[PDB]
Write a protein that binds this ligand. Structure first.
Ligand SMILES: Cc1cc2nc3c(=O)[nH]c(=O)nc-3n(C[C@H](O)[C@H](O)[C@H](O)COP(=O)(O)OP(=O)(O)OC[C@H]3O[C@@H](n4cnc5c(N)ncnc54)[C@H](O)[C@@H]3O)c2cc1C
Ligand SMILES: Cc1cc2nc3c(=O)[nH]c(=O)nc-3n(C[C@H](O)[C@H](O)[C@H](O)COP(=O)(O)OP(=O)(O)OC[C@H]3O[C@H](n4cnc5c(N)ncnc54)[C@H](O)[C@@H]3O)c2cc1C
Lengths: 164, 164
């Protein structure tokens, strides 16, 4: 079988929906983060999620060397946070965490305390696939905001949820 | 750093949101599918998605032995499909695919033609982590309905999308 064209693959994907997260890190290699939607739960013992991140990025370099990271599922009101960590407005990497919303929990990685879900994590394993590092991370702390319907991405726009 | 309790992990995840897919298969080891939300795109060259499925699933062994599968992102109108494939009504596998909305495209796996997005795939890699097989699959064909509006899962209920 022949795989679909890359362009057709991305077009089709725009028609699926995802949550939106920010993955962030800090430690001896410094502070960094990027917006990431390719994230999912893997198993509960040990509690493990994975995230797939293009290895060419500033943030990927730092995340992999710090060896710790946070995954921060954004609430409906946080599209600007997502835009910032996707590089909309070209906000310099270390200027991205200037606000009380980020604090430390267990690892030293910055946690978004008003995110719908925040997992503080250590990296356990990495599987490289084409351009992306698939990073398997074990959850060593969790946090939740009070009142957060999700930020959703779909058809290249942000959205949130409503009952069926 | 000690990991969080499994129970905390699961609770936290209920507060995140995910699309809802049905992962289906067919071939020499038979028909099977199940509903899966632990799915994401990995890279576009080659076009690869991954999905995490509990090895306890009846459908897991059949999917991995057939070597082929589809991922079907369900639309807002399709909660009954999600329910059928999560085992509600305990519908027998073959009978799950009796409806003519399920066709073959390229691999032989059943593809839901009216699903918001359907990727027909061949398995490329399987990495077993805790209770789950993380299955990497390369996209060989696709199909999309005209209706992309997502079925979403969140706080243990179905939802769909709204503008912000
Ligand atoms: C919103 C949502 C998201 C989900 N996400 C995931 C996910 O990301 N990963 C995951 O692993 N699960 C996921 N699930 C769970 C999943 O879909 C199922 O609910 C789970 O696998 C249990 O399904 P089952 O009741 O069909 O049990 P199973 O044991 O998996 O199978 C039972 C029924 O289906 C298949 N049969 C069973 N035994 C035999 C036999 N001895 N001989 C011949 N035929 C047999 C069975 O045949 C039977 O019809 C999700 C469910 C929901 C609702
Ligand atoms: C809602 C959203 C989700 C994103 N998810 C991821 C992800 O899971 N993994 C990742 O490495 N980067 C993701 N990004 C990209 C990322 O956050 C930065 O924008 C990127 O590192 C910036 O580099 P660039 O200027 O070359 O932009 P780009 O040329 O746009 O980025 C190029 C490469 O890194 C960025 N991938 C996966 N989903 C998306 C997406 N919806 N939009 C754009 N790129 C995507 C890509 O993945 C791609 O391989 C996402 C961006 C947004 C807005």
């Amino acid at each position: 079988f022949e795989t679909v064209a890359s362009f057709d693959f991305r077009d089709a994907l725009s028609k699926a929906s995802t949550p939106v997260t920010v993955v962030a890190t800090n430690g001896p290699f410094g502070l960094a983060g990027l917006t990431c939607s390719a994230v999912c739960s893997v198993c509960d013992r040990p509690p493990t999620v994975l995230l797939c991140i293009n290895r060419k990025s500033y943030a990927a370099g730092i995340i992999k060397s710090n060896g710790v990271l946070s995954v921060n599922w954004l609430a409906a009101g946080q599209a600007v946070i997502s835009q910032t960590f996707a590089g909309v407005g070209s906000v310099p990497m270390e200027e991205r965490f200037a606000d009380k919303g980020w604090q430390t929990i267990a690892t030293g990685a910055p946690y978004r305390m008003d995110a719908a879900v925040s997992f503080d994590c250590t990296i356990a394993n990495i599987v490289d696939v084409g351009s992306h590092s698939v990073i398997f991370a074990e959850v060593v702390a969790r946090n939740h905001a009070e009142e957060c319907t999700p930020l959703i991405y779909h058809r290249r726009q942000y959205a949130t949820t409503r009952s069926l």
